Amino acid sequence: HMERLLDELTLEGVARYMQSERCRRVICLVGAGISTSAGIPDFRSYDNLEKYHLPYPEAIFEISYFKKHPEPFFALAKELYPGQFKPTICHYFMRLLKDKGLLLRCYTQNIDTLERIAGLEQEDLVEAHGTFYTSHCVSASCRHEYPLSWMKEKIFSEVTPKCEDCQSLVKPDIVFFGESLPARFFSCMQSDFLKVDLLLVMGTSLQVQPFASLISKAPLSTPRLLINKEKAGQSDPFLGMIMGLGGGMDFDSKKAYRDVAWLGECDQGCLALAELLGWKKELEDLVRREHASIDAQS
Amino acid sequence: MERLLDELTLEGVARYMQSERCRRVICLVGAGISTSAGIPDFRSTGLYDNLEKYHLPYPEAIFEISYFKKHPEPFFALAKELYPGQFKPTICHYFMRLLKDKGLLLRCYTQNIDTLERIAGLEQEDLVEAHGTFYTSHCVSASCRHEYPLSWMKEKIFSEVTPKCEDCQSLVKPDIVFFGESLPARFFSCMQSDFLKVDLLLVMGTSLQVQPFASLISKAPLSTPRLLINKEKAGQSDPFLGMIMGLGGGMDFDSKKAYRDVAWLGECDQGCLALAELLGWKKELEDLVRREHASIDAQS
Numbered sequence: 303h304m305e306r307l308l309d310e311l312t313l314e315g316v317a318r319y320m321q322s323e324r325c326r327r328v329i330c331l332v333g334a335g336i337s338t339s340a341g342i343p344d345f346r347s348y349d350n351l352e353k354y355h356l357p358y359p360e361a362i363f364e365i366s367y368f369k370k371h372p373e374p375f376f377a378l379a380k381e382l383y384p385g386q387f388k389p390t391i392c393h394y395f396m397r398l399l400k401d402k403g404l405l406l407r408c409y410t411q412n413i414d415t416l417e418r419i420a421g422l423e424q425e426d427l428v429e430a431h432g433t434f435y436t437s438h439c440v441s442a443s444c445r446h447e448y449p450l451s452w453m454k455e456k457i458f459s460e461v462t463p464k465c466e467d468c469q470s471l472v473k474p475d476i477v478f479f480g481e482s483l484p485a486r487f488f489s490c491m492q493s494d495f496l497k498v499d500l501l502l503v504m505g506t507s508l509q510v511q512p513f514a515s516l517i518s519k520a521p522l523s524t525p526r527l528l529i530n531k532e533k534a535g536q537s538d539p540f541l542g543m544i545m546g547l548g549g550g551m552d553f554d555s556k557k558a559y560r561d562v563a564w565l566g567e568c569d570q571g572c573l574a575l576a577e578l579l580g581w582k583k584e585l586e587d588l589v590r591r592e593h594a595s596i597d598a599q600s
Numbered sequence: 601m602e603r604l605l606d607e608l609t610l611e612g613v614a615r616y617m618q619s620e621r622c623r624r625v626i627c628l629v630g631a632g633i634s635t636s637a638g639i640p641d642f643r644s645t646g647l648y649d650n651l652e653k654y655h656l657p658y659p660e661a662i663f664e665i666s667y668f669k670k671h672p673e674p675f676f677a678l679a680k681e682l683y684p685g686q687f688k689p690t691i692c693h694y695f696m697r698l699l700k701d702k703g704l705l706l707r708c709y710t711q712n713i714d715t716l717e718r719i720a721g722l723e724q725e726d727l728v729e730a731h732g733t734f735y736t737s738h739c740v741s742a743s744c745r746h747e748y749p750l751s752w753m754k755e756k757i758f759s760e761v762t763p764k765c766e767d768c769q770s771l772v773k774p775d776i777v778f779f780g781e782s783l784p785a786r787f788f789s790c791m792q793s794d795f796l797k798v799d800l801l802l803v804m805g806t807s808l809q810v811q812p813f814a815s816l817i818s819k820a821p822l823s824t825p826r827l828l829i830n831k832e833k834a835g836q837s838d839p840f841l842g843m844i845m846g847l848g849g850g851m852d853f854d855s856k857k858a859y860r861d862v863a864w865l866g867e868c869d870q871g872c873l874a875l876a877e878l879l880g881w882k883k884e885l886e887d888l889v890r891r892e893h894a895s896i897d898a899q900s
């Protein structure tokens with residue numbers, strides 16, 4: 303009774319399916335691997351922070367520790383700022399998907415704002431771990447909002463961002479350890495995953511939540527293409543390897559029917575896929591134009 | 601005299617642009633296409649008020665090459681003051697990117713130095729920066745001429761350090777054309793090839809009073825239509841001789857012998873929207889502007 307929508311478990315099969323009338327709504331799930339070529343470190347895989355005496359390394363991303371000791375976070379943020387914020391080919395591939403009427407939603411666990419810089423708009427986006435694009439005063443009574451331009455100025459000046467109204471700490475809208483995921487994630491998830499025809503999973507190893515559990519919630523017939531440095535999503539987040547029961551990624555077993563792994567850099571996978579679709583020149587033209595627009599500032 | 605427009609209106613130009621005859625469009629653009637982006641028009645007040653302490657002989661002396669070479673501080677003081685923060689191209693800039701994407705843009709000639717054409721996605725091959733640009737800078741010494749990028753020049757201006765060459769310590773100047781300097785060599789090489797091939801001249805946001813546009817407008821082929829999108833009519837007088845009924849290729853919108861020149865008077869952004877509408881491109885243009893502006897807002 304299960305439906306077999308790919309004619310073969312290869313990138314060629316995914317491309318042919320994307321060209322079929324049945325593939326109308328694509329969801330992208332993207333992680334840190336789509337931004338390493340832009341100079342953002344692969345957080346899946348502190349040495350300058352020895353002076354800050356953190357109990358454990360992860361304490362700088364813990365909401366309670368951050369509220370009383372914010373300097374190491376902003377200091378690290380000051381350092382990890384790349385020379386220039388230029389989205390990658392993979393980012394612009396998703397913009398191409400939108401132009402062609404196939405993008406239902408891009409879910410990202412990155413906080414680097416490169417999806418928005420690439421031209422994806424809020425309606426196309428679910429920032430599942432939040433974003434630097436907006437910040438708020440931590441005081442519940444104030445909650446004054448600050449734009450990224452204001453926050454960047456404070457970080458680069460190494461001035462701990464304080465609210466201009468009440469002088470309390472201003473926090474970017476990223477999900478620290480100890481905080482809930484954005485409400486927009488849960489609302490979009492329920493509607494989106496009932497009607498998704500293809501899952502494009504790029505640059506994430508599906509270990510962190512919510513993607514770790516979300517991958518298995520696609521419809522049973524929806525094909526899932528992983529473009530990543532390594533295979534991922536084969537284990538249950540809590541039970542480990544249980545031969546894919548309950549919707550895990552299954553690329554290799556005798557029961558595989560819909561999951562495809564393309565191992566390598568995200569940029570090269572999107573170019574290979576774009577070529578199979580006849581979109582490579584259009585993608586390379588877009589990237590050249592948009593990179594030039596940003597390079598024009600340097 | 602060959603008349604290629606069916607009527608001397610925006611509608612007539614739009615029909616011509618959709619014809620096979622109109623393959624190569626040149627844009628000539630001036631300060632009027634960047635005022636809605638917050639870039640000041642020096643031809644139009646109080647820009648120099650904070651330079652009074654420098655006791656300039658005349659305000660524009662800061663842009664004359666010899667005075668700049670001995671007193672560079674006032675120019676850099678003003679540049680720091682006028683840095684807009686974010687650079688957001690206008691609808692008019694993005695209309696030219698659309699012309700490019702649609703294979704109609706032979707060339708954009710600009711007398712602006714603000715780099716908004718490049719930020720809108722026009723590449724060097726598409727551009728003739730007839731008055732130079734802030735995009736690159738050069739050591740002023742003829743025996744060195746080391747080039748410096750915009751990021752280098754920005755860091756010096758914001759640090760309030762007069763830019764000096766790292767090889768010879770001579771003064772480094774943004775590639776703006778100062779009084780007393782020749783126009784860029786690229787302008788002359790492209791002008792002579794382009795103005796032989798151009799099927800339509802689109803002139804936006806320039807008064808056609810300063811050179812090279814003042815003289816260049818009359819060098820188009822006699823049959824090539826010319827559309828002016830500007831707050832006021834321009835290009836009708838000879839740069840030196842004044843009004844001469846349009847002899848020598850001057851713009852002729854209203855005489856009984858007018859045949860190819862059209863003026864649409866208003867803001868450049870509004871005229872480009874109205875032209876895009878008549879080309880069937882308005883949705884594409886408005887989507888492009890929204891998307892690219894959202895991206896610039898995201899770069900913060």
Ligand SMILES: COc1ccc(Cn2cnc3sc4c(c3c2=O)CC[C@@H](NCc2c(C)noc2C)C4)c2ccccc12
Pocket residue numbers: 639640641642643660663678679680682683684713714715734735750753754757776777778779
């Ligand atoms: C992309 O990087 C940048 C662009 C613009 C500015 C500041 N900024 C803004 N907007 C303008 S608009 C304009 C100028 C100007 C200017 O410096 C400077 C030259 C002016 N023209 C002078 C002139 C006259 C009058 N007659 O001959 C000449 C020559 C016209 C920058 C300032 C600092 C760093 C980068 C900058």
Ligand SMILES: [Zn+2]
Pocket residue numbers: 439440441444445446465466467468469470
């Ligand atoms: Zn506050």
Ligand SMILES: [Zn+2]
Pocket residue numbers: 739740741744745746765766767768769770
């Ligand atoms: Zn030098």
